[PDB]
Amino acid sequence: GVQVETISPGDGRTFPKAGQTCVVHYTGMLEDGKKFDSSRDRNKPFKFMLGKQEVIRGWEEGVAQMSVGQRAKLTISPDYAYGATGHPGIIPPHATLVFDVELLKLE
Amino acid sequence: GNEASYPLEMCSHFDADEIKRLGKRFKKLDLDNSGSLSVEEFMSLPELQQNPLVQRVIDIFDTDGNGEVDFKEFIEGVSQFSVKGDKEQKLRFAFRIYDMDKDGYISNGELFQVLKMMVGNNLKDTQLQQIVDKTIINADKDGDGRISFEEFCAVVGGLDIHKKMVVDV
Amino acid sequence: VPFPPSHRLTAKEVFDNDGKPRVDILKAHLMKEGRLEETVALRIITEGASILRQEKNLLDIDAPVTVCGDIHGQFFDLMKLFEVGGSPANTRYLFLGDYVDRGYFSIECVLYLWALKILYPKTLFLLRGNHECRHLTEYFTFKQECKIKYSERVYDACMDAFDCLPLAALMNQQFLCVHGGLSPEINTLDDIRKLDRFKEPPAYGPMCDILWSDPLEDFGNEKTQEHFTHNTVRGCSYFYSYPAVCEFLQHNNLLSILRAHEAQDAGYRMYRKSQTTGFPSLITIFSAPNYLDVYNNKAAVLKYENNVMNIRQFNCSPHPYWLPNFMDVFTWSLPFVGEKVTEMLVNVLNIC
Ligand SMILES: C=CC[C@@H]1/C=C(\C)C[C@H](C)C[C@H](OC)[C@H]2O[C@@](O)(C(=O)C(=O)N3CCCC[C@H]3C(=O)O[C@H](/C(C)=C/[C@@H]3CC[C@@H](O)[C@H](OC)C3)[C@H](C)[C@@H](O)CC1=O)[C@H](C)C[C@@H]2OC
Ligand SMILES: *C(=O)CCCCCCCCCCCCC
Ligand SMILES: [Ca+2]
Ligand SMILES: [Ca+2]
Numbered sequence: 001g002v003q004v005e006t007i008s009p010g011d012g013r014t015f016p017k018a019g020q021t022c023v024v025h026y027t028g029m030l031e032d033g034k035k036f037d038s039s040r041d042r043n044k045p046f047k048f049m050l051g052k053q054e055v056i057r058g059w060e061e062g063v064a065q066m067s068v069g070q071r072a073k074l075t076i077s078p079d080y081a082y083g084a085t086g087h088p089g090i091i092p093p094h095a096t097l098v099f100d101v102e103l104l105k106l107e
Numbered sequence: 108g109n110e111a112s113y114p115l116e117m118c119s120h121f122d123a124d125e126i127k128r129l130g131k132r133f134k135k136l137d138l139d140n141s142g143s144l145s146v147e148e149f150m151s152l153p154e155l156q157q158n159p160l161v162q163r164v165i166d167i168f169d170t171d172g173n174g175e176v177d178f179k180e181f182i183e184g185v186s187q188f189s190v191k192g193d194k195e196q197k198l199r200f201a202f203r204i205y206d207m208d209k210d211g212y213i214s215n216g217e218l219f220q221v222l223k224m225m226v227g228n229n230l231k232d233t234q235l236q237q238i239v240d241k242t243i244i245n246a247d248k249d250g251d252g253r254i255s256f257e258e259f260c261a262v263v264g265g266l267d268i269h270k271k272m273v274v275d276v
Numbered sequence: 277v278p279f280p281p282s283h284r285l286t287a288k289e290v291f292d293n294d295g296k297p298r299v300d301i302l303k304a305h306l307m308k309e310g311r312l313e314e315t316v317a318l319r320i321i322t323e324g325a326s327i328l329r330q331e332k333n334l335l336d337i338d339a340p341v342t343v344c345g346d347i348h349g350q351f352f353d354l355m356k357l358f359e360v361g362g363s364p365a366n367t368r369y370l371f372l373g374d375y376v377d378r379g380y381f382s383i384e385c386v387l388y389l390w391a392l393k394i395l396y397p398k399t400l401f402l403l404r405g406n407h408e409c410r411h412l413t414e415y416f417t418f419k420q421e422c423k424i425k426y427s428e429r430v431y432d433a434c435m436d437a438f439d440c441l442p443l444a445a446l447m448n449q450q451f452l453c454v455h456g457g458l459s460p461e462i463n464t465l466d467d468i469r470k471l472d473r474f475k476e477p478p479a480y481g482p483m484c485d486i487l488w489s490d491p492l493e494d495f496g497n498e499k500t501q502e503h504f505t506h507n508t509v510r511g512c513s514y515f516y517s518y519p520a521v522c523e524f525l526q527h528n529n530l531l532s533i534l535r536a537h538e539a540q541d542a543g544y545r546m547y548r549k550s551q552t553t554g555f556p557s558l559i560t561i562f563s564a565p566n567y568l569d570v571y572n573n574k575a576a577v578l579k580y581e582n583n584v585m586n587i588r589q590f591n592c593s594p595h596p597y598w599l600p601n602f603m604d605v606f607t608w609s610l611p612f613v614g615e616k617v618t619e620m621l622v623n624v625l626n627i628c
């Protein structure tokens with residue numbers, strides 16, 4: 001699964017809808033918390049848009065559960081992420097990834 | 108196309124029925140019924156919109172270089188992805204995704220253009236340019252400042268990406 | 277966008293006739309993402325290592341001194357640090373460790389700092405940090421970095437050099453300067469002196485603690501007054517208390533414990549002060565601004581002179597982009613290229 005634990009509030013009413021472009025800043029980490037990437041590294045907010053299968057499952061199911069301005073910890077499981085194949089160069093096989101995601105804007 | 112004309116000769120992994128099946132696909136796809144197939148017609152259906160590689164695939168398939176994918180090219184093309192397809196023809200296909208002008212070498216500019224195509228605005232151009240420069244500085248083993256198939260495969264060859272470039276026909 | 281210079285600096289370019297490195301030539305080259313000849317790089321590392329090897333576990337440093345915290349491979353912020361703290365040419369420096377990992381410019385940091393140590397062996401001091409070891413560098417991106425930019429030969433050289441790094445510093449007969457902090461098995465300065473420094477830090481013990489300790493998350497308003505407790509954060513070493521620090525201080529007649537090891541949003545942290553002296557019992561100095569490019573923190577350097585501890589703050593500086601783990605654009609883009617290319621065909625075939 002993708003377990004969401006809030007870090008910062010946001011308006012508890014404006015959640016993202018399918019087709020809507022979610023503008024976010026994230027910092028991905030391995031289960032031990034060791035960071036592996038972040039949009040802050042590029043000072044570029046990662047923009048993807050719900051529904052259209054543009055991110056791993058954990059993100060679709062997780063970022064949907066977030067309100068604008070909310071900063072939360074999505075704890076995604078391999079099957080909802082990169083599974084046993086992992087991802088060449090960054091993600092080791094059978095890995096649980098914790099994402100600190102901050103829903104910035106919607107467009 | 109639907110009807111007659113003289114013989115199409117091709118080379119592939121496909122058996123008599125797989126070609127028939129693919130033949131029917133190419134049929135629906137034909138839209139204007141010209142026998143060939145163009146980007147406008149490929150762009151025709153639902154999930155060929157935000158697939159940044161669609162015009163790339165068309166150009167690799169377009170072996171005779173005339174803008175359209177004819178049946179022979181359609182078969183030859185999809186055959187690279189057939190199961191029974193060898194890992195090498197798949198990595199060669201991959202090389203062709205970056206090697207825009209088909210001259211056998213991935214140049215700095217091509218690598219930047221192909222990547223920008225998929226990344227869009229998720230990376231600043233200076234960032235993308237910086238990492239393109241550093242990848243070529245390191246993989247360029249032979250010296251000419253442009254990546255050949257030999258060098259591509261030296262960096263990529265051990266990745267299992269090709270094990271997924273497989274479609275059912 | 278600028279391109280990294282292909283010309284690798286040679287011995288005669290980096291070292292002058294007196295065998296003195298030309299840190300100015302080095303700085304300029306490194307900043308453009310320039311590389312040295314593996315042999316030159318190795319000479320810098322190895323010659324600095326020889327100097328460090330001769331120094332004592334606990335250095336004896338006189339004020340004036342600019343004390344600096346974690347650097348973490350943020351080479352371009354290391355350049356700003358020197359602007360704020362003063363030229364090494366006329367300013368005494370003391371670094372508290374953690375020169376590598378996190379930042380993708382760790383080798384340029386060791387090379388510039390080692391050359392600077394060769395150049396100012398008696399005014400620029402480097403202390404050991406928990407990251408200057410094998411287990412952490414293999415875990416994080418330093419080993420991978422040495423392999424991408426140079427080779428494992430350079431890496432091994434750094435490892436053996438790191439084993440030569442002093443463990444602590446007694447600054448102005450007043451402060452105990454270390455990277456992590458106190459240890460249950462270190463109750464006096466002699467306890468540090470009697471340690472064997474030349475090795476990979478043990479899984480536990482005095483040397484481990486010095487490099488790994490942290491004050492309790494509640495270094496003042498505690499209810500217990502337990503001196504040392506296991507550090508659940510670090511998965512090793514301890515957490516030390518205000519009474520613990522006040523006990524070490526009184527016992528060894530020290531003013532305060534200056535250290536780093538912990539990110540600070542203001543680049544520093546003054547802890548609960550001594551009821552006798554109106555001075556903080558502990559000080560954390562952190563010299564890596566915008567840590568991990570994530571934390572939006574300021575960095576800082578302690579400047580101690582004429583009985584005045586002045587803290588200078590500084591902000592982040594621009595730096596080139598490296599994909600996560602030095603991964604190349606091909607390895608980076610391929611899985612996506614495969615996915616989409618296959619998806620186009622799946623979609624194309626599914627029209628029947
Ligand atoms: C041409 C360049 C490639 C192209 C790159 C970009 C647009 C730049 C963009 C900021 C990505 C980062 O680049 C710095 C980097 O982000 C990670 O670090 C990361 O934080 C992560 O997990 N993210 C990113 C944010 C959305 C969630 C998730 C994801 O869903 O990512 C997607 C992903 C990797 C899905 C895989 C694809 C293969 C399938 O087989 C697998 O199915 C199991 C799932 C991303 C968005 C792909 O659509 C696009 C790309 O890959 C990955 C660890 C690796 C990835 O680099 C590759
Ligand atoms: C239009 O221009 C022709 C497109 C139709 C092609 C289908 C041909 C069927 C091929 C099946 C024979 C198997 C060959 C070994
Ligand atoms: Ca047509
Ligand atoms: Ca054609």
Ligand SMILES: [Ca+2]
Nearest residue numbers: 208210212213
């Ligand atoms: Ca080319």
Ligand SMILES: [Ca+2]
Nearest residue numbers: 247249251253
């Ligand atoms: Ca070449």
Ligand SMILES: [Fe+3]
Nearest residue numbers: 346374537538
């Ligand atoms: Fe640190």
Ligand SMILES: [Zn+2]
Nearest residue numbers: 374405406537
């Ligand atoms: Zn540390």
